[PDB]
Each structure stands twice: as C-alpha cells, then as structure tokens.
Ligand binder design. Structure first.
Ligand SMILES: N[C@@H](Cc1c[nH]c2ccccc12)C(=O)O
Length: 526
C-alpha cells in the first residue's frame, strides 16, 4: 500500500485554491486535502488575463459553466492582446501614435490560421506584401477578430452562439474566493486559517508535516507550495535555488491600480492592452464598470517615482490621491519545480512579466502535469524529473518568446528600449528569426482548432504556433526577406489562396454588423 493518502497545500490565493479544487476533484475520497491559508498581503484587484484552455482544462473538469462562474468573479472577455506603440518613439500614452497613416497597434488573437495547400495564410499574406499588391497589416488581413475588437464586440451572440475563440479577464481574488467556497463546500477540502510556524522534515529531508502557529501538525505525504514569491517550502525549507533571469528580461517592478470606467461612453474593450512605455510597458485589463492597469518597468532604467508619475500621467490620475500597488517582481524559475515531496505551483515556482498572460496558464499546466505525473509514496524520481522537464521547457519557451517582443521592437529612443537589443539572444530564437526571414513557418499547427483546444497535451506540445510568431514579428514591423520559395513554383495555389482573404473580409463585416457589443453581453451575464 504505497498510494498518497494526505496532501497539504500552503497558500490560499489563486494557485492554492485552483490546486485544491482540481486535485480534490481528481482524487475524490482517496486523499484528504488540507490548505493552510498563510495570509498574503492585501492588494488592489488590478486584473488578470487568461488563455482559452482555462475553461476546458480547469473549469470543465470541475463541472462549472462560464454562465455560473463568470458572474461570481466579475469576469469579462479577452479576444486578443493589443500591442500599442511598440514601433514608435514617445511618452507612455494610452492612445496609439500614427505610423504610415495608421495607428501604431497590432493584435495577437487566439485560434489557428487557416491553410491553403497546407501553407499557412500568413505566408500568402507575406507573398502579397512582397509582390506589392497589398499594404494591409498582417493581423487585419488574416484575422476576422481584428474588426470585431475595433468595434468592441462580444466574442459571442447573446444567446450563446460562438463567433470567435476567446478567454477571460477577471479579478483573481474573486476567483480564489469562488474556488475556496467551491472546494470547501463541495469537494471537502479543509481550510485551515493562519501562519505556518515551522516545516517538519525526516532524516531524508522529506516534509512530514506543516506546524501551525496554534501548534497543530498538518501531516501529509505530499506538499504543494503555493506561497507565492515567498517560496516558503520549495526555496526556504527545501533549499532549492531560484534561477534569476532578470538579465534576459529587464522588467522587475510594477505600479498598479484599478480605475472605475464609464462603459456607456465607449464600451468595454474585449482585449488586454499592452501599452509601450519609456522604460517598460503597461497592461490594461477591462471588465464591466472598471479596468485594471499596471506599469511594468525595469528598476535599472527608471526610478520608482518616475514610473509612478508616468503611470498616473497616462491615466490622468492624481498621484497624491490614488491608491497604488507597488510591487517588486521575482523573474525566473526554480532550478527544479518539484523536489522530494514538495511541488511548487504558481509564483512559488516561476514568474514572467504578464506580457502574454501566462500566469494562470502556468498554474493550470502545473496542476495538469502534476496529475499526469502523480506520485505514490515511493516518489520514483522519473516522475518528478519528467514533471520538472515539462515545467522547465514550458517556462523557458515562453520566456524566450517574451524577450523577442523587446528584441524585435524597432524602438531605440530610450536607454531601456536600446538596451534590449544589446541583450544576448538565445540560439533557438536566433534560429527562429532566421527561419522566419527565409520565409519558413515557425511551429506550424498540424491539427485543426477542435483538436488543439480539445486536448490539452496537443496545445502544450505546440503552444506558440506560427500564427503567434507572425502576430508578434509582423506586428513589430519584421517581415520575411522573401516569401516561401516553393510558392514561386505554385502560382495557381497562390491565385486560389486569395479567396481566403476575401473570406476574412466577409467575416469581418458579418461580425461587426451582427455581434452584440462586449458591454451588452457582460450586462446580460452580470
Ligand atoms: N496556445 C495559445 C497561444 C496564444 C495565442 N494568442 C495568445 C495571446 C495571449 C496568450 C497566449 C496566446 C492559444 O492558442 O490560446
């Protein structure tokens, strides 16, 4: 009899309660689950963005429909990330500057690009730009979602009819609270209030119990560290080193707040914005009646007061009379996410600036992979080693992807933007950029959207597809040196492919003209 009987989780934020809920649903009565609150510092709800797999991987597993959980956490919709002013110099401002007679913005939507002759639509767009017969931006040519988002449409018709692939904006504290109620009332997880006095270990350094300040020993076989940047178990108790990656991603601070919004004026933007600043970038996460916003910056390039004032100036806030969250970031990951019988999940495990909304996703993936590699009490090394490799490969892949946004940006007008070009580029990303310039697809999707979004593992093995690389590279002004050479041998395939551009144009009109506003759906939902 070697199976796990007791699990103890340290930390009661988003990571803690997502972990408690999922594992309790997965294991049922076979395991007792106990979560020790370890109270975190109370922050303004500054918003959080997600990716589509959240519903299928997580909420569907718990049996919770969006119609049920979204009203409980004031959730709203995300169709893309909108990048503002990453090509033009200037101050940190909310509005896009003008470049070549167009606003300086580009979108990074979800979903997979359609293909013709098994070549992605991106390559036909590149061919037409090279041929000089179009001057249309990549995102407006290849995604119908762009038109929807400019007209601030919902991603669905009011009666549930799907239109476009989407994810969510919400206040993470409300979600944690909703999940806490769910896990304790429905999944028989025991919530224990208070601080951890000490962590009890045996002769082999495995954890045997968490001792609470009232002297109670929370005994277990497996321990999940969800204590955030503190890493109270994985870093402090187990002495696992954290690998600082601030050398590669310079931003390490944020100043943030939530701002009340009059939605009747201009609606609710169904996308997360990432607004380029003098020494970093600011997020905007719109929900009904209010949006969350924060300036992510690098302390090597801006003073605290500088950032704070720039942030407030952009939103027209009085810096003296505005509640602000001032946060220092831990950028990087543990050498290993799982050590002995301690598994770190969430900020305890790793962190990147939220440029592409990876936070909740990293938790979800960690949770999912923990169940895929779930141990018994022998704790076979091959299980944790495999888990650690998947977590490491996931993190480093996205870290490199994020770095590319700053490296490929043409901006050089401040020391921050200029310093990004001086940073070492990882060999794998150097290769990707050279492939892209030669006209090759990068990580082309080989399945349809139904398979990709249907099976988590299909997406996990191909998370940043060709579409995403084109969104960012073409978005930032980088195009291939020449189109895919094989296309010059297939003119008939090229002539045929143009109908797909006509289809996107048709969808763009249809969506704008018949979809309800994001605002209207949110009011019907809430
Ligand atoms: N695998 C993700 C990739 C992705 C596309 N667009 C994004 C925008 C933000 C974050 C991730 C993404 C998805 O298709 O959903």
């Amino acid at each position: 009899d070697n199976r796990i009987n007791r699990i103890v989780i340290l930390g009661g934020g988003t990571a803690g309660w997502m972990t408690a809920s999922y594992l309790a649903k997965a294991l049922g009565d076979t395991v007792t689950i106990t979560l020790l609150e370890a109270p975190a510092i109370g922050r303004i709800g500054v918003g959080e963005a997600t990716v589509p797999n959240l519903q299928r991987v997580f909420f569907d597993f718990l049996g919770l429909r969006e119609e049920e959980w979204m009203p409980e956490c004031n959730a709203a919709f995300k169709t893309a990330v909108k990048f503002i002013n990453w090509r033009t110099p200037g101050p940190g401002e909310a509005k896009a500057r003008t470049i070549d007679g167009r606003p300086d913005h580009f979108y990074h939507p979800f979903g997979l690009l359609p293909e013709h002759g098994q070549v992605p639509l991106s390559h036909y767009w590149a061919y037409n730009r090279a041929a000089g017969t179009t001057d249309e931006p990549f995102d407006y040519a290849c995604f119908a979602e762009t038109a929807a988002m400019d007209a601030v449409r919902a991603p669905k018709w009011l009666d549930g009819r799907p239109a476009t692939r989407y994810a969510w904006h919400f206040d993470a504290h409300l979600v944690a609270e909703f999940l806490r109620r769910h896990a304790t009332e429905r999944l028989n997880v025991e919530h224990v209030q208070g601080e951890m006095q000490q962590v009890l270990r045996d002769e082999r350094g495995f954890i045997t119990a968490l001792r609470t300040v009232e002297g109670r020993d929370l005994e277990g076989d497996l321990f999940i560290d969800c204590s955030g940047f503190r890493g109270l178990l994985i870093n402090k108790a187990m002495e696992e080193p954290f690998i600082d990656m601030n050398d590669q991603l310079l931003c390490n601070r944020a100043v943030a707040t939530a701002i009340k919004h009059d939605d009747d004026a201009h609606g609710v933007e169904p996308y997360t914005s990432a607004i380029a600043m003098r020494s970093g970038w600011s997020w905007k996460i719109p929900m009904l009646g209010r949006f969350g916003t924060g300036y992510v910056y690098s302390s090597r390039f801006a003073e605290k007061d500088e950032a704070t004032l720039d942030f407030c100036r952009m939103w027209g806030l009085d810096p003296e009379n505005t509640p602000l969250n001032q946060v220092a970031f831990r950028v990087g990951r543990n050498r290993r996410a799982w050590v002995k019988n301690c598994v770190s999940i969430g900020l305890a495990s790793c962190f990147l600036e939220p440029l592409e909304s990876t936070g909740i996703y990293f938790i979800t993936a960690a949770i999912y992979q923990l169940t895929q590699h779930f141990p018994d009490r022998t704790f076979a090394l091959a299980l944790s080693d495999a888990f650690n490799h998947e977590i490491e490969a996931m993190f480093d892949d996205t870290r490199d992807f994020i770095q590319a946004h700053f490296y490929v940006s043409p901006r050089t007008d401040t020391p921050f933007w200029k310093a990004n070009k001086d940073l070492h580029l990882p060999e794998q990303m150097r290769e990707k950029i050279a492939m892209y310039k030669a006209g090759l697809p990068i990580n082309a999707p080989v399945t349809d959207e139904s398979t990709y979004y249907g099976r988590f593992e299909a997406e996990f093995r191909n998370f940043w597809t060709n579409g995403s690389y084109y969104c960012i590279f073409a978005g930032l002004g980088l195009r291939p040196d020449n189109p895919l050479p094989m296309l010059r041998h297939r003119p008939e395939q090229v002539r045929e492919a143009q109908a797909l551009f006509a289809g996107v144009k048709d969808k763009q009109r249809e969506l704008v003209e018949t979809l309800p506003s994001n605002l209207e759906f949110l009011r019907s939902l809430h």
